[PDB]
Write an enzyme that holds these catalytic residues in place. Structure first.
Site, short mmCIF file in Angstrom:
data_model
loop_
_atom_site.label_atom_id
_atom_site.label_comp_id
_atom_site.label_asym_id
_atom_site.label_seq_id
_atom_site.Cartn_x
_atom_site.Cartn_y
_atom_site.Cartn_z
N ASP B 97 -29.83 -42.97 8.51
CA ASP B 97 -30.01 -43.36 9.91
C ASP B 97 -30.30 -42.08 10.69
O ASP B 97 -29.48 -41.16 10.66
CB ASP B 97 -28.81 -44.13 10.45
CG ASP B 97 -28.47 -45.36 9.64
OD1 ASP B 97 -29.35 -45.85 8.92
OD2 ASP B 97 -27.34 -45.82 9.75
N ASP B 128 -20.66 -49.83 7.45
CA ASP B 128 -21.44 -48.67 7.09
C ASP B 128 -20.49 -47.56 6.68
O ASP B 128 -19.55 -47.23 7.41
CB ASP B 128 -22.30 -48.21 8.26
CG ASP B 128 -23.66 -48.83 8.24
OD1 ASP B 128 -23.98 -49.52 7.25
OD2 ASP B 128 -24.41 -48.59 9.19
#
Lengths: 145, 144
Positions: B97, B128
């Site tokens: 990310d 996550d």
């Protein structure tokens, strides 16, 4: 000891190996509690890698073994609970708690880990565990990064 | 985003091969909207979200507030999913990310392994896993 997370799938299939590769991974998870890099490294192809993602990757079976061996000089994997295991495209995923015990302090910590394993012909060619290192470090008073 | 040395070259590895994975991949891309009101539509009412270094949010409202909270200080500039897989109603994404801390304008490529539980195409769980400190220190933003 290891509580089932509230978010754990209640589909009982999610926590069991449904393929030869997932089976190997769960056997490997069990083997982790050996704290024995020479034992563990037998699961790995020569062309492999390991990375506890907060820490540097080890590329190649030798580096993997010595990197694993290094971890087991300071911590014991007392237990590995895999809540979820899945796989696609030769990748196996494990959502786990690893009960880790820092040998220098004797403090244990339930490490929430999401791990990915690449297997080729039943041998691990990649293993990356994702987790937060700091919370582990601070819990067990063990400087790892 | 540089493909990690360990990234599957199997092109099917990063491609959705199931409706759930398609939803998740679409969700990953929708993250760059930084829009919690848009994102929450992906979530079931009975749901949870947790960036695992931080406390979980249970319930669609709590997830939306949390995502909205994250987006006031952080931009999800990009999500590269190297690997996506699924079994038993769970989707796994190995990703980077590209995060940009708004208060500092500093960005970090966050290696994330994420898991998604979907029920009838809605996210009932999103967790996550990543190392927060690396991110905090890269972007001078102590999120914890």
């Amino acid at each position: 000891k290891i509580e089932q997370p509230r978010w754990a799938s209640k589909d009982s299939a999610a926590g069991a190996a449904s393929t030869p590769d997932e089976k190997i991974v769960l056997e490997f998870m069990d083997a982790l509690t050996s704290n024995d890099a020479a034992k563990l490294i037998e699961y790995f192809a020569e062309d492999t890698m390991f990375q506890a993602m907060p820490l540097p990757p080890a590329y190649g079976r030798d580096a993997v073994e010595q990197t694993l061996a290094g971890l087991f000089t300071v911590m014991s994997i007392d237990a590995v609970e895999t809540f979820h295991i899945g796989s696609s495209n030769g990748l196996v995923y494990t959502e786990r708690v690893d009960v880790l015990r820092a040998l220098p302090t004797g403090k244990s910590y339930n490490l929430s880990v999401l791990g990915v394993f690449q297997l080729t012909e039943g041998k691990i060619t990649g293993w990356r565990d994702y987790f937060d290192l700091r919370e582990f470090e601070e819990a067990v008073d063990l400087p790892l990064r």
